[PDB]
Structure formats: C-alpha cells, structure tokens
Ligand binder design. Structure first.
Ligand SMILES: *[C@@H]1O[C@H](CO)[C@@H](O[C@@H]2O[C@H](CO)[C@@H](O[C@@H]3O[C@H](CO[C@H]4O[C@H](CO[C@H]5O[C@H](CO)[C@@H](O)[C@H](O)[C@@H]5O)[C@@H](O)[C@H](O[C@H]5O[C@H](CO)[C@@H](O)[C@H](O)[C@@H]5O)[C@@H]4O)[C@@H](O)[C@H](O[C@H]4O[C@H](CO)[C@@H](O)[C@H](O)[C@@H]4O[C@H]4O[C@H](CO)[C@@H](O)[C@H](O)[C@@H]4O)[C@@H]3O)[C@H](O)[C@H]2NC(C)=O)[C@H](O)[C@H]1NC(C)=O
Ligand code: NAG
Ligand code: NAG
Lengths: 113, 202, 221, 211
C-alpha cells in the first residue's frame, strides 16, 4: 500500500537528530565521567524529500497515532518500550509460527537445488 | 544552514581559506566539499563530518589538505601547490546524501547549500589600494570590489560593469546608476568597501 | 494494529499483520526505528495563542509514555509553568528520565495562572508531547516539549537557541489574556498575528528608572 | 576518473521557449544525478538532485529525466531570470565529476543604447591621468561599435572596453568604454566626443566641451 500526503503543508527537508550508538572515539571518551553531557550525545542529519518520501512519512505518523494511542491505553506500563521488539517477534512468528515446507506462500524457502 | 567563507596569495604559499558553518552544528552526518571555477566548476576535495574521513581528487593527490574544527565550527583548506593556475573563485558546500536516521544509503547527493563566495589571486603583486566620481573605481588590486549606492538603499537602475585589467596590471571598472533628472541636486553617494586592502570610500 | 513502514529503495510502504512477503528481510533489530516527527511539518499554527487552544485539562485518565529513538529538529517548543490562582501548581513535575526536547529554536516559556479543571493536560487533537527521546500524552511542569506524532520504520560561540518568556492570564480557558514579558516592568500584549522572529526584534528595541510595571501594545503597518 | 560532458556549450533562446540540456557519461550511473544554476555574480544554487527531485525553493518548471548513461534537463517556459550557467554532477562514484557549464543567453527585441558621457572629475585630473567614460545601457544585441572622437582625432589603443552580461530583469547588455590618458594629452584638446554604431537609425555622437 502507498501513502498520500493529506496534511495541509509538508516540509520536504527533514532536519533530524539521533544518537551514535558507536561513537567510540577509542581511548577515554565513552566514560560517563569524561563523556558528553545530556545535550551533546546527538548527531544531526538531513533528509531530502526524495521521491515524496518525507511527505509520505509525515502522514504515516499522523495515521499511526490512532493505533498507537489505543495500544497505550491497553497497557499499564508508564513507559512502553517493547513496541519495537513486539513487531520483531511477530515477524518471526508470521514466518515460523507453525510448521513449514516449500509448498506455498506462508513459508519462505527456495531450495532450487 | 548557510555557509560563509574567508580568504591574494604569493606563489608557493599556502592559501589559508576557512569555511565557517553558521546557523548549524558542524559535527553531523553530512559531508563538506570544496568547489572552484577557473575563468573560462571543479571539485577539490571532500571531508566527512563524522569520523573525519577526508577524500580528495586524483589530480590533487599531494597538493590539498582539508581540516575540520568543531570548536569554532569552521573548515580550513591549505593549498601548497604553486600551480599558478589556481587563481580562481572558490566555494564550500555540504551534501547530506540520503541518511535515513544514521542508515547511510548513499553519502553523495545534491549539494543543498553553498558558500557566500571567495576570490583568490595567485600572483606576485603587492596589494594596492583603490581609487574612487562621474562613481568610477580604478587603479586597484586585487579583485573584487563591492559598490553600494546610498548604503544599499539604491539597487534598481544601478548597473556596475565588469573589471578590466589595465596594461599596468591594476584593475579598473565603472559604476554608474540612472536616477531621475529632477532628483539630481535634491542626496546621493556611492559606498565602496575594498576588503583586500581594508579601505572604505564614500 | 500499529502500522509500520518498510522503506523500499525509493520511499516507504505500509506492511503489517495482513501484508507480508519474502522480499522484505529483517536481519537485525537495528533496522527497527521509532521516529518522532514534529507537527510543524504538517502546517499547524505555531504561535502561543493557537497552540494553547489544542491543550486541555482532564481527570481520570492515566498518562502514558512511549519511546522514540530519533526525532526532527523543532523550531518552536513550549515550556509551561502554570499555577492555580490560589498559589498551588497545575502540572505535574517531570519524573526521572524525562527531560526537555533536545533541539529547539524558540522555547516559549509560558508563566501564568489558570483554573486547571483537571489533573493532567492532554492534547485535544491527539498528538503527543515530545520530550528527550520520550513521547508522552501529558504536559510536565517546567519541561520543554514539542507537539508531534510517532511512526515505526524498517530500514535496510557555538550552535544554541533562545527562550521566550510569557505571562498568561486564564490559561486553558476560552478567555485568555497573553502578555510578552520583555522585562519584569515592561510587558507588551500579544496576538495570533505575531511571529517568533518579530518578538525577537522587540527586545532588539525594547531595551531589556521608576516607571514600574508597564503594559504595552503594538500597532504595526 | 568517471567523465561526463554537458552539451551544447552555447545556447540562446527566447522567453517562453523550452530548453533541453544534455549531459552524457563515460561510465554507467544509477538514478543519482544533480543539476546546478549559477547566475552572474552569484554563488551556485541546487536545481535538481537524484536526477528527478526538485531542490528546496525551485520553481516547478525545471524538468529532469533520464537514467544510466544519458541524462537530460528541461526548462519549460524559460524566463529572463534564468540567465545563468548550468553544470552537470555525478553521484554514486568517485571522484565527483562536473560537466562543461552550458551558458544560456536570452533573446530580446532590438533596444536603443542610452548613450551617456561623463567628463573626468577634478580629483581624477589632479593626479595627472584623466579618464573619460562613455556609457551605453539597455541595448540588444551585444554587437556594438563605439569609437572616440577627440577633436576629430580617432582615439585608438588608449580606450578600455568592457561589456557586461544580460540583465536578470531587463535581459539586455550595457557597455562602458573608458578612455584613459595622461593629463598632458588631455588639456591639449577641448571637445571629447563618443559615437556609437548600433543595429537598432544613425550613429549617435555625444560631445563635451571644456565646460
Ligand atoms: C492528522 O492530520 C489531520 C489533517 O490535518 C488532522 O485533522 C485535524 O483534526 C483536528 C482534530 O480536532 C481537527 O480539529 C478541528 O478543526 C476545526 C477546523 O477545521 C477547519 O479548519 C482547518 C484548519 O484551517 C485553519 O487552521 C489552520 C491551521 O491552524 C490554518 O492554516 C488555516 O488558515 C485556518 O486558520 C481545516 O484544515 C479544515 O479543513 C476542512 O476540509 C478538509 C478537506 O478540504 C477536511 O479534511 C477537514 O477535516 C475539514 O473538514 C476546516 O476548514 C475546528 O473548527 C474544530 O474546533 C471545534 O470543533 C471540533 C469538532 O467538534 C472539536 O474537536 C474542537 O474541540 C472544537 O470544539 C469547539 O466546538 C465545540 C462544539 O462542536 C464546543 O463544545 C467547543 O467548546 C469548541 O468551541 C477542531 O479544532 C482539524 O479540523 C483536522 N484538520 C483536518 C485538515 O482534517 C488530525 O488531527 C491529525 N491527527 C493527529 C493525531 O494530530
Ligand atoms: C530499486 O528497486 C528496483 C525494483 O525493480 C530495482 O530494479 C533496483 O535495482 C533497486 N535499486 C537499487 C537496488 O539500488
Ligand atoms: C534584550 O535587550 C537588552 C538591551 O537593553 C539586552 O541587554 C539583553 O541582553 C537582551 N536580552 C535578550 C534575551 O535578547
């Protein structure tokens, strides 16, 4: 399925911020005492709207809000993190939930030999 | 966001030019390139903002050095090559590539923002002050010169001509603006700033 | 339930419980990323008078928080310090681990009083209040935040900002009187026809001595 | 290493025509290309990235398509402000290669050169080297013929000619022919004339006596 940017406006350039989980700087930089503060842990970045990606992205989040809001109302976790790991396991279960064979679309095996 | 540049250079000397990045942190997932255009464009080199991975052009193997600085948020370029053909205009610009939140699909996309501009003249000639009415600015070195009318308040109708190098080496241009004949005598003054010699003229 | 977006070579496509093919391959949990996008990219109104029209108090609803790994740079953020007219607070203190939004350009620090007919302040439209890599559904006292929404994706002499102080009267109600606190004794009125850069030009001339508190009003051209 | 050539070098078209610029490559390239515009006396700007997407702040008339070895840029309904040099750009390879910038020229109906003359200034004549200026403004095409008549004498070799680019708003040229000589050969003559021979009735001559 595709996404249509139904929002009134769309900023094609996405100036984003994220953390470098491997910003090692071998030596003494990863020590919390000698490491950065709570503000200098990020590394910025820019994403151009290549092939309508950024406008097609700002709509996915506006639409995910509904299903995500109901998921939060269900759980009692004051801070919910397992959402990422949830879909990680469901993907394996969808492909390896029961038996398998190279006979149909449920399982993914291609033994040409 | 936008970029500004800072920079005559004697032969066999290192042309020290800095590319200060304003309105944005320099340490990021972007790249930073150096571009020049000889009179009558050319890529110089690329430095990775993250991990400091400097990559240059084959024609500039042992003649270019690009360094970064996170404290002052600037990027310097030293040119020790006394090629004498590098007397051109230089530019610095970034290219964010296609970086999907750290995932780098390709680190070479269109260069979105460029620099203000920086002119360099690789020649052996002492920098001589300018000389400004009709206002004509002649007998100056080196180029370029910025002329503003009424402190920049007068832009329409003004048309400054290109600079022609005289036989004596000193450049010479002319700056004339068309104003209503009724306004002549009721004020006006040409404002000039020669940054190479640091000499204002009004 | 919750939809994910798998970027395929040019752009994104939605595929979830119903939609799955062998072409997609997820070899490591690093490909999964929860992205928090600000509402600025949608074209909503960003000034203080309109932003506060999207927030309201409500009791009997347990607040919930969700994590987002990466986010978008925000230009206008908000930091509320509202207290009831008797003197008591209105918003809860930010719990441990929750901090202000990392990247903001204009942090609108609102400092006023209101009725606060509710325990927590929620977003009327349903958007989340973005914090430091944490998206909550309420507003925490004295904590900078930015409106926005969250998605879930499957992938293959320095820079600083400036805060803006405000003085609200009747926050969270249909009748609210906002004031720009340029100085403790010189404040000007506000309206939806004021831009953040315009307020930056005010101090540029407001010059922030027995005149006392002075309420000002601008009529530009 | 990877070579790319942008053609044609020169190109002239009228306002409203559709321009087509090509940029061939020596080696194969994916759908990753860029086009740039550089107006006279201004830094370059990004026009297209990835060979298909428009940059931020670009009018929806710079159409670019193609893939592989041959790419193409198209400007629908060319405008006067589009007077600039357009270059090529490579991606997904090293070194980053450019192309020969195609210089764009605009076509306009013939215009009358507004001829002006400015005798030297009291400060310009005190040093000992006076200079006369003969200005031509708002004429098309750039083809002109400006000669100096200093008391019937055809001045030659001492004049410095300088033609500018086509104006971004007027789409026309402007010539500033300056005659520079020493004060010795200046005071020996009274009238300083400047005739102009342009395509658009008869040669116009502007003189100036001692005053
Ligand atoms: C995902 O994205 C979508 C798309 O943007 C979001 O949709 C939005 O959802 C909110 C949720 O509440 C809606 O709020 C209601 O908005 C209307 C106004 O809508 C008209 O104006 C819209 C904006 O135009 C102005 O504002 C913008 C930005 O500020 C400016 O740039 C403009 O210049 C204008 O100033 C406009 O977009 C609307 O478009 C119409 O047509 C398009 C198609 O062309 C449709 O898609 C739209 O849906 C719409 O039909 C429209 O022109 C307000 O008037 C509402 O106010 C009251 O009534 C609401 C509904 O009952 C209620 O919820 C409010 O609380 C409020 O209540 C008032 O009335 C009550 C009685 O009825 C009283 O009891 C109460 O006291 C009070 O007086 C309301 O604010 C948006 O309209 C909607 N927008 C669109 C485009 O769909 C969605 O929110 C996003 N999801 C998330 C999770 O964020
Ligand atoms: C993008 O997807 C198309 C789909 O056919 C494929 O042919 C192309 O090789 C892909 N691009 C890559 C893998 O860079
Ligand atoms: C506001 O302007 C005054 C000028 O009197 C200056 O001293 C002060 O630092 C400025 N403050 C801000 C936040 O701009």
């Amino acid at each position: 399925e595709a996404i249509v940017n139904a929002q009134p406006k769309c900023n094609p350039n996405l100036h984003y911020w994220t953390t470098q989980d491997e910003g090692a700087a071998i030596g003494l930089a990863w020590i919390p005492y000698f490491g950065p503060a709570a503000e200098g842990i990020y590394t910025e970045g820019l994403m151009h709207n290549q092939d309508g990606l950024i406008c097609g992205l700002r709509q996915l989040a506006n639409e995910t809000t509904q299903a995500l809001q109901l998921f939060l109302r269900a759980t009692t976790e004051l801070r919910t993190f397992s959402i990422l790991n949830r879909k990680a396991i469901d993907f394996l279960l969808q492909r390896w939930g029961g038996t398998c064979h190279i006979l149909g679309p449920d399982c993914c095996i291609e033994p040409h030999d | 966001v936008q970029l500004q540049e800072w920079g005559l250079v004697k032969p066999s000397e290192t042309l020290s030019l800095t590319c200060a990045v304003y309105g944005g942190s320099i340490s990021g997932y972007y790249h930073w390139n150096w571009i020049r255009l000889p009179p009558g464009l050319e890529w110089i080199g690329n430095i990775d903002g993250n991990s400091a991975s400097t990559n240059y052009n084959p024609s500039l193997k042992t003649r270019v050095t690009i360094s970064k600085d996170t404290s002052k948020n600037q990027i310097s370029l030293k040119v020790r090559s006394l090629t004498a053909a590098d007397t051109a205009v230089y530019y610095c610009a970034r290219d964010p590539g296609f970086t999907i939140f750290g995932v780098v699909i390709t680190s070479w996309s269109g260069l979105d923002s460029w620099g203000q501009g920086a002119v360099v003249t690789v020649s052996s000639a002492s920098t001589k002050g300018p000389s400004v009415p009709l206002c004509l600015v002649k007998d100056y070195f080196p180029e370029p010169v910025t002329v503003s009318w009424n402190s920049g308040a007068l832009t329409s109708g003004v048309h400054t001509f290109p600079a022609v190098l005289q036989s004596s080496g000193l450049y010479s241009l002319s700056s004339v603006v068309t104003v209503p004949s009724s306004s002549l005598g009721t004020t006006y003054i040409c404002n000039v700033n020669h940054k190479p010699s640091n000499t204002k003229v009004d | 339930s919750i939809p994910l977006g798998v970027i395929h070579n040019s752009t994104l496509q939605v595929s979830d419980v119903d939609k799955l093919v062998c072409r997609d391959k997820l070899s490591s949990t690093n490909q999964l990323r929860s992205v928090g996008l600000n509402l600025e990219g949608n074209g909503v109104a960003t000034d203080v008078p309109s932003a506060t029209k999207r927030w309201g108090f409500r009791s009997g609803v347990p607040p919930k928080v969700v994590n987002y790994e990466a986010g978008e740079w925000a230009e206008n953020c908000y930091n509320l310090e509202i207290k009831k007219p008797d003197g008591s607070e209105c918003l809860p203190a930010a719990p441990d681990g929750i901090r202000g939004f990392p990247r903001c350009r204009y942090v609108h620090k609102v400092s006023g009083t209101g009725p606060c007919a509710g325990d927590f302040a929620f977003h009327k439209e349903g958007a989340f209040f973005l914090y430091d890599r944490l998206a909550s559904t309420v507003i925490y006292r004295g904590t900078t935040f930015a409106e926005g929404v969250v998605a879930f994706l499957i992938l293959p002499s320095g820079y600083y900002s400036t805060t803006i102080r405000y003085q609200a009267t009747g926050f969270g109600t249909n009748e609210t009187e906002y004031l720009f606190e340029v100085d403790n004794l010189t404040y000007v009125q506000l309206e939806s026809r004021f831009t953040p850069q315009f307020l930056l030009q005010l101090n540029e001339t407001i010059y922030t001595n027995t005149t006392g508190k002075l309420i000002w009003k601008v009529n530009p051209e | 290493d990877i070579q790319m050539t942008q053609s044609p070098s020169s190109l002239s078209a009228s306002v409203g025509d559709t321009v087509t610029i090509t940029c061939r490559a020596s080696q194969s390239i994916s759908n990753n290309l860029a086009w740039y515009q550089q107006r006279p006396r201004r830094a370059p700007q990004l026009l297209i990235y990835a060979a298909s997407n428009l940059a931020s702040g670009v009018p929806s008339r710079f159409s670019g398509s193609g893939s592989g070895t041959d790419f193409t840029l198209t400007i629908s309904s060319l405008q006067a402000e589009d007077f600039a040099a357009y270059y090529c750009q490579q991606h997904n390879t090293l070194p980053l290669t450019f192309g020969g910038g195609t210089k764009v020229e605009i076509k306009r109906t013939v215009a009358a050169p507004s001829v002006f003359i400015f005798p030297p200034s009291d400060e310009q004549l005190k040093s000992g080297t006076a200079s006369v200026v003969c200005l031509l403004n708002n004429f098309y095409p750039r083809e002109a013929k400006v000669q100096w008549k200093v008391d019937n004498a055809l001045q030659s070799g001492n004049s410095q000619e300088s033609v500018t680019e086509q104006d971004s708003k007027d789409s026309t040229y402007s010539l500033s022919s300056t005659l520079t000589l020493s004060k010795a050969d200046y005071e020996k003559h009274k009238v300083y004339a400047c005739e102009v021979t342009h395509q658009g009735s008869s040669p116009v001559t502007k003189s100036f006596n001692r005053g």
